[model samples]
Target: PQAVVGTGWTSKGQITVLDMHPGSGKTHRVLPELIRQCIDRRLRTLVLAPTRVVLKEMERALNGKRVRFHSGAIVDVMCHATYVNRRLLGRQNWEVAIMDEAHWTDPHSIAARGHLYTLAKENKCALVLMTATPPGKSEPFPESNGAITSEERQIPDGEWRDGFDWITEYEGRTAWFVPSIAKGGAIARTLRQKGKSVICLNSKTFEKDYSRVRDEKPDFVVTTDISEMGANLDVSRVIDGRTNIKPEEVDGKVELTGTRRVTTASAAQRRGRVGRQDGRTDEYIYSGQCDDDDSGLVQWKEAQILLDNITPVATFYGPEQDKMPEVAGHFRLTEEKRKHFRHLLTHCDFTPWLAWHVAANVSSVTDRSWTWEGPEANAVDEASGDLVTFRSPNGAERTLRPVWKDARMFKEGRDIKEFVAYASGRR
Candidate 1:
């Protein structure tokens, strides 16, 4: 039921919870040492994090010498900007595989893990999985077989659900929430009565909410995304949209979703804003629904409306959720346009759809033989054998080259507005 893994000199055979989590430091202590040992023997290392955000943070932590492998244009751009080599993950040479936040050890999650494990196994590398929370009692996850390294395996009775109700103060914490009029009123009243200064996070919608809450005039102001990380503000409470409902027992079952929808973990991440600072109290208010979750139809309609209002232009690209293999295909930019396109889209605030649209057009419009001084001509590049010429600001030019061989990359219906915005700043 157990498999033994080995490092070059040390043999870690068939690990268990009793053998893994040593004192306070788990893989935080062990994996790095393993990596050091492997490197001493001239071995390469590969570290994988569970979430994109976690991966980004980890990338920052392990900055020098190691190569990073991740998919997604955004991730590639981020790595490019930060000077990290964005290797195609599955293929690489490594002597160690460190899986951070490895709680996602299911077969579904294991697809990613399996790929990493296969790479490690093939290379005869040491495999290390680190997690604060061990896996559930399910197959594939080692914890199901009592193979985790943690002693405090499960939460005590009544602690799992009741873990939330503890109280704290609000003195220098950062928090952000969707500020509705009713919730803003409650915050103003609560802070004023306590005689403490309040801070509101910044957003494009700040002006509207500011007018509503300005009469109270809280002390500091910060932006939503910025404050979410780490900032200085006192957060007494974080009011996310949620619903409270009294369940009517039908036989032995309870009917609650009919009347209420509580905030999910994603919503709670936003709510935990207050406690990030040293001394801050957090209060959350919920309505009958987290923004009116009616029937499935109403929920879908509400989601659509929200998407219509705040959504950018790029959500249309990439894979549809219903499709096989998750992401459908690849999109790439030519060398000349890549820098300018990167600047316009990633560096600037231009939307992705708008950026891609501009990129395509710039390639078409600026092809060789299309005179810059003359009147606008047809996009057909008479010179350079019909290859498009993308002229940079420095008068340097490169042809637009498609990275993906698939016809889908150049097909119509790919929004061209993004390309226009990116190139001449016209779109």
Candidate 2:
């Protein structure tokens, strides 16, 4: 279906954005055939992934199909936005560029946004951006020519487990995906205590434990989001302890905090792990609280609603194209400084603290050595509160009571110096 869709778009000479649900075989099924089609048509192709793990997985998937793969050649596979910015930028020879987990290319990163924009404009390459969960209105996602999205009608309903009694009687292989390595370790210990063979895999144990789990064919494999994307595993049941949203207080501000949630897209991917070759109903158990009001259940439901209502088609560049540079230019500074601020935006979550940090980095007028101390070491005053007090180079005491309203108004080019000047004013 992806190849057919892609082939039609190729003829149209435009870009394609595939907003596939996580477990929809966009990587394994869609990508290989698309690359194959591009190869047959004598078009050089480049596949970009968000992480090294996914890149290796993509390479394996491509190799398994006997597709010719290289690092920086006609059929190139690269990972990370930094690498793509450094390597693939300004090269106009390629005919197709596919970004897997394309959400990483959002406007937060100047390198990612600018490089992709340049490629789409200068090279006129047929772009295919793939992501399980595409960015929403709040995120700085680039506009796409068209989008292909999937929706799930019903939520997964399976038995929940926080202990090992359920696994012992279970007659098939099980995989547990938790939020953190420590959680995986605790669950693994519990499983082992019940005499069940178990394997654990996360960033720390990925290189060492992945092979062991694959080779040993353990009855249970506990992991994190590392295995969420493209790992083909043999399991009849998947338990997700990883998905949860909790309120966190950052500088006295309450904010929703979590790495990733069990959205419709991610739930599909987790369930996709089981019964890949043969279509079998796999039991998906989510250990997080879905009943409590503040337990992220609302966000999960909202995500489902968004997924269901996603626009099937959208133009890549037009009015939306202008928004990227508009947001990038918010800092009243030089072009280079603006670009650096955008780059920093990609790294930090869009928070007032992160914005302040970026502002401090981009502005030469601020003293780097002056640290935020006293009553509020690194507090962010949403209203009227004393934030940071520092001493000038001449030993004059300067106190900055940063108002969030003023911080929000500070832009890239014209207002940056004024904002700094205002921030350095006596309390």
Candidate 3:
């Protein structure tokens, strides 16, 4: 049953997809121009993006000119997560709504489309959907209909040298992604020992930490997901710790948890980070030390994860397999997922314990907290609050082994010493 959407326009609205390459004028040029036109026409406008990364840039573009509802509010810039009035589309009398990185809205989400359709048809508003990566075959997305235009532009990457398969490379593309906080320190120290100027952008103090090393032009930037996206560094090497499992503190002991894949959209964005600079001579983007490929495929397997998360029926046994199809169907789990569930339940090695741990960690992620449950969780040398783990235990599943296995191989003694010194003393 398809949604009863308007014929692409209820009153008189239009949508155009400015599908351009990353680091292009999409944000700098095209967006401001559209805003200018809306300002000229005196149309009420709203600009939305998944991150403040783009919204803040647009705010800078506005330059405090009639920023509020100047007789009309002229234009309002906001994050998509905040735009939550279901009846807002027709009720607010908006004339234009622009969505940056529009791919995040369509395909998987119908909630976005419902309000958008009302805005387009009932309110007679123009929709400007922007993205470097298009999710479906056509622009303006596939499901909806009418008054559509797709302007797909292909601007090749600038100064991007291929990343290395091995750690051997020109030192420029050599950022290291690590498994945990302790290992991050170990790697940062090892790099510094080689006379390399290194900056560790872990979850603990990313904003201040990145600022410290950005101008200093560190030789290597060790990053975790805490400092992800729009890393306006001039050097141009990106290594992120996007993992599927992490050691958890279950029954007060360390154990592995979760099995999920990285979204393909993420892989696309980091490469965007890599290609932004001119000196991209030999810049390599590795998951961890170039030995691991943390890049993942495009798939959604949240059925099992979601069912257990939203219910109160039983602990780690909520809804069970009998109600899986019901939960999956309502949750919009794809047909392939249903089949995957069928196969996974009958034969897969995934256990109930893993699901419980994943859900618990996810709850912590929701709380914006991190505690290393691994053996390193009890590290004598680190501070917990200043401890920066991702909101959840998601990253570098494959690469952690070497860090644990080769813990003493690197300059661990001095590295741990200095790391403890700065982390403990600085705070």
Candidate 4:
């Protein structure tokens, strides 16, 4: 019945966007208010968070206010809950929806942007999209304050402690923001070597890593983008793993300052970590260079794509290659056609790449052998390292990488084992 004023969000629209700083009471105050209004109106509400970390925060803040969630509470909160993942709990309908950390929506997941668009355009629900840093588009941060509100702040011009040397000497109440988990690990290790109590937080094990940071009050925390959101690490400062120093003129004398990596939007999210609750004259250190989004997974991804493509081609062209035409010289065709085309590389070229491929994917191994019904190879362990002795169906010598444990055969059950044995030279 009463109002909670000046928390952050001001207006509610069919698709309202709130751009406010973290710890600006967006969650603790405003979210509780929104949820209460929905409950009072008897409207079905769905609250969404971008990550599990944020989801944890949301539940804590909401429950702390005595506005708890349950199946009968008429308000449901979920993380990574989207139409794309098909984790929809039940009723497809909702009267109101809210998405926290809107701009950070992963395009691959469609959990944020596309999902918001669906509620706005399709369901016509009263939607609220919140983020501190909106995108470049005018639509995201609307020109008029009609659909949005902003209380975001900027640090004093003369801030940004010079360089990395300060980090070596600095004491506790600090956090390091890195572009990759590897960088976070490296930074944490270096901090440890320097006798700084540090913890590395990444996707793989943020549950324990985050708790350690909070409970231990470590000297330094090295974190991936995981802590970039609503996490209040309560550190005196946060340093960037990736940055770029640039020459600038403030008033008359030239000054040197660092740059944020990738985009200003993302930089805001990272920089805002220093302002966990709020700030001016905030402290943040930066690298002279910038960090990259290099996950080092590209090489593995390329090989996987090639393997995936082969499956469909195998399915269509016939898995039983013996039944298919193996030779331009087969089928009792005209002598001129057969002999000329084959000129015989065994009567045909057979394409060495394909020849090496299909046979290389060993579906299973009854013994230590990769031996197949169509004649697979065997892995003979020697003192000569772990290379697999994978002979193709035709018995041409081939070497398999040490990645043999990853062998995944088609699980649907091998078809045509008996006649395949006949073609495989098995008695």
Candidate that scores best on lDDT: 2
How far residue 38's Cα lies from its native spot in candidate 1, in Å, is 6.2
Candidate scoring better on lDDT of 1 and 2: 2
Q: How many clashes does each candidate structure show, in the order listed?
A: 28, 15, 9, 4
By TM-score, highest first, what's the ranking? Answer: 2, 4, 3, 1
After superposition, candidate 2 runs with Cα above 4 Å error: 1-3, 6-8, 11-13, 18-25, 40-44, 61-72, 83-95, 103-123, 131-164, 242-249, 252-261, 279-281, 287-328, 331-427
For residues 187-249, could you state the per-residue lDDT of candidate 3 as single tens digits? Answer: 676555555677877645464776666577777776644333545555445454433233223
Q: How do these models rank on lDDT, best leading?
A: 2, 4, 3, 1
Model 2 alpha-carbon miss at residue 187, Å: 2.3
Task: Pick out the ten consecutive residues of candidate 3 with the lowest summed lDDT.
Answer: 397-406
Candidate 2 per-residue lDDT over residues 1-427, each given as its tens digit: 7543645555424557786655566777788888778777867776777666677778866884434443423577776444433431143355677778764422222233234434565545667767765543221112221231222222222232444355578788888777655556777777787778998877667777776766798988987667766675677777765363333334533344354444444454565566454344556665443221222222222112111111112122332333232232232334454344434333322232334344535355343332233233333332344443455556666554332222223221123333334344321
Model 2: per-residue Cα lDDT at residue 276: 50
- Inter-residue clash pairs, candidate 3: 10-121, 69-73, 70-73, 173-283, 173-284, 204-388, 243-395, 243-396, 365-391
Cα lDDT over the full model 4: 0.46
Best by TM-score: 2
Against the hidden true structure, what lDDT does model 1 obtain?
Answer: 0.34
TM-score, each model?
A: 0.36, 0.58, 0.50, 0.55
Candidate 1 C-alpha lDDT tens digits along 222-309: 2333233222234444444332222232322222233244323223334434433333333443323232222222222211211222
